[PDB]
Design an enzyme around this catalytic site. Structure first.
Site, PDB file in Angstrom:
ATOM      1  N   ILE A  38       0.909  -1.167   0.000  1.00  0.00           N
ATOM      2  CA  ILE A  38       0.000   0.000   0.000  1.00  0.00           C
ATOM      3  C   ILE A  38       0.940   1.207   0.000  1.00  0.00           C
ATOM      4  O   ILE A  38       1.744   1.294   0.909  1.00  0.00           O
ATOM      5  CB  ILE A  38      -0.920   0.052   1.224  1.00  0.00           C
ATOM      6  CG1 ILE A  38      -1.866  -1.140   1.296  1.00  0.00           C
ATOM      7  CG2 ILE A  38      -1.678   1.363   1.246  1.00  0.00           C
ATOM      8  CD1 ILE A  38      -2.242  -1.496   2.698  1.00  0.00           C
ATOM      9  N   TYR A  39       0.936   2.025  -1.037  1.00  0.00           N
ATOM     10  CA  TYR A  39       1.706   3.255  -1.115  1.00  0.00           C
ATOM     11  C   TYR A  39       0.873   4.433  -0.619  1.00  0.00           C
ATOM     12  O   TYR A  39      -0.358   4.419  -0.698  1.00  0.00           O
ATOM     13  CB  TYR A  39       2.175   3.504  -2.553  1.00  0.00           C
ATOM     14  CG  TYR A  39       3.320   2.601  -2.949  1.00  0.00           C
ATOM     15  CD1 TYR A  39       3.092   1.348  -3.495  1.00  0.00           C
ATOM     16  CD2 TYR A  39       4.635   3.000  -2.751  1.00  0.00           C
ATOM     17  CE1 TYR A  39       4.151   0.520  -3.851  1.00  0.00           C
ATOM     18  CE2 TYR A  39       5.695   2.192  -3.108  1.00  0.00           C
ATOM     19  CZ  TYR A  39       5.454   0.957  -3.655  1.00  0.00           C
ATOM     20  OH  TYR A  39       6.524   0.159  -3.995  1.00  0.00           O
ATOM     21  N   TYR A  40       1.559   5.451  -0.095  1.00  0.00           N
ATOM     22  CA  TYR A  40       0.922   6.623   0.498  1.00  0.00           C
ATOM     23  C   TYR A  40       1.481   7.886  -0.143  1.00  0.00           C
ATOM     24  O   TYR A  40       2.514   7.863  -0.817  1.00  0.00           O
ATOM     25  CB  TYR A  40       1.129   6.675   2.024  1.00  0.00           C
ATOM     26  CG  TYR A  40       0.518   5.509   2.759  1.00  0.00           C
ATOM     27  CD1 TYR A  40       1.180   4.288   2.840  1.00  0.00           C
ATOM     28  CD2 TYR A  40      -0.728   5.626   3.373  1.00  0.00           C
ATOM     29  CE1 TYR A  40       0.621   3.215   3.503  1.00  0.00           C
ATOM     30  CE2 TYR A  40      -1.296   4.556   4.044  1.00  0.00           C
ATOM     31  CZ  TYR A  40      -0.616   3.353   4.109  1.00  0.00           C
ATOM     32  OH  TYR A  40      -1.171   2.279   4.773  1.00  0.00           O
ATOM     33  N   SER A 104      -2.242   5.877  -1.621  1.00  0.00           N
ATOM     34  CA  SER A 104      -2.122   6.224  -3.022  1.00  0.00           C
ATOM     35  C   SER A 104      -2.538   5.105  -3.961  1.00  0.00           C
ATOM     36  O   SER A 104      -3.630   5.139  -4.476  1.00  0.00           O
ATOM     37  CB  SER A 104      -0.694   6.606  -3.317  1.00  0.00           C
ATOM     38  OG  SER A 104      -0.534   6.872  -4.679  1.00  0.00           O
ATOM     39  N   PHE A 105      -1.702   4.100  -4.149  1.00  0.00           N
ATOM     40  CA  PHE A 105      -2.018   2.979  -5.025  1.00  0.00           C
ATOM     41  C   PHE A 105      -1.480   1.694  -4.415  1.00  0.00           C
ATOM     42  O   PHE A 105      -0.676   1.750  -3.524  1.00  0.00           O
ATOM     43  CB  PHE A 105      -1.442   3.195  -6.416  1.00  0.00           C
ATOM     44  CG  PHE A 105      -2.323   4.011  -7.322  1.00  0.00           C
ATOM     45  CD1 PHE A 105      -3.573   3.563  -7.684  1.00  0.00           C
ATOM     46  CD2 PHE A 105      -1.896   5.217  -7.815  1.00  0.00           C
ATOM     47  CE1 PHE A 105      -4.384   4.306  -8.504  1.00  0.00           C
ATOM     48  CE2 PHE A 105      -2.700   5.964  -8.647  1.00  0.00           C
ATOM     49  CZ  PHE A 105      -3.948   5.511  -8.986  1.00  0.00           C
TER      50      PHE A 105
END
Ligand SMILES: [Mg+2]
Ligand SMILES: [Mg+2]
Lengths: 177, 177
Positions: A38-40, A104-105
């Protein structure tokens, strides 16, 4: 702090399964990791602008929080990388959201890790991006890593394309189309 | 998420050592913790304004990252609290600083934890603030906790002052003089 230096190859041919067969005798299998990242992003400081990343990874149930800094090289993927294992993914994600970070994505992959001398070869099946190889060198200069990768692709007859883009960046471009 | 509800007493008399003697027979000792807390602030969102806190704790070598939300009560110390254990304090501190957080102040204490039924009694020797008691209740309403604390101080003849200020806030005021 720690400087992660690796080369990332987009595999054109053959398949990773066939590449796995070609290295099986002289490369020792380490492990296979199922990784869900999980990107932020920070709303007041765009990481896409500053070339930074913040990632919460689930790899075979182990939860890792990773900061990545700006790229320091144009010929390999070289970035500062600070990682800590945390006890609970949900809670860590909550803390980031309570602190103002926005998810983010997401990137999901099957990574197979092999060992040859002081190098780590990662065969990567990225969901929606395709097949990639990452090569990292223990106590290796940028010249040594580039040289070993050239020998690696030649010895195993791999058609490829080198890229210094992160998987997060490749996913975004692949989502453009 | 989790709602931490406790009552904090500033001890006027007697000493915590003497209080330890008065509860020794009917309260069961759990453990003693040496806690070193590094508090942080966000430069674009003042936690002192929003009544939030971000803390990296070292308690007997175990490293805990804790977010605390705004107070929800005036009669007890009631706050949302999200905690995760992390593998390395230095690295976690680096990640926070890389993300833009600034270290605020540090709180160090010796906490002795005791158990009486569904309540936890913490005898706290705070460096530079003095002697405090915190009482927490497992599956207890705010009315039950207040009632038990009243019985606790009466039975052990403790002179005290209740406060809902955090240790971080008390430290700041004590530093004013
Ligand atoms: Mg990589
Ligand atoms: Mg407390």
């Amino acid at each position: 702090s720690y400087i992660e230096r690796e080369i990332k190859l987009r595999v054109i041919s053959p398949s990773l399964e066939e590449i796995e067969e070609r290295i099986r005798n002289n490369y020792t299998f380490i492990n296979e990791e199922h990784q869900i990242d999980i990107y932020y992003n920070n709303p007041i400081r765009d990481f896409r602008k500053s070339d930074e990343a913040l990632r919460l990874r689930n790899t075979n149930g182990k939860v890792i929080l990773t900061y990545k800094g700006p790229k320091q090289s144009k010929e390999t993927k070289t970035r500062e990388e600070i990682e800590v294992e945390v006890s609970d993914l949900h809670k860590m994600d909550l803390i980031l959201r309570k602190l103002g970070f926005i998810r983010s994505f997401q990137v999901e992959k099957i990574r197979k890790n092999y060992k040859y001398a002081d190098f780590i070869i990662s065969l990567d099946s990225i969901k929606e991006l395709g097949e990639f190889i990452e090569i990292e060198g223990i106590n290796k200069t940028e010249k040594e890593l580039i040289s070993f990768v050239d020998e690696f692709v030649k010895k195993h007859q791999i058609q490829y394309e080198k890229t210094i883009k992160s998987y997060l960046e490749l996913l975004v471009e692949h989502a453009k189309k």
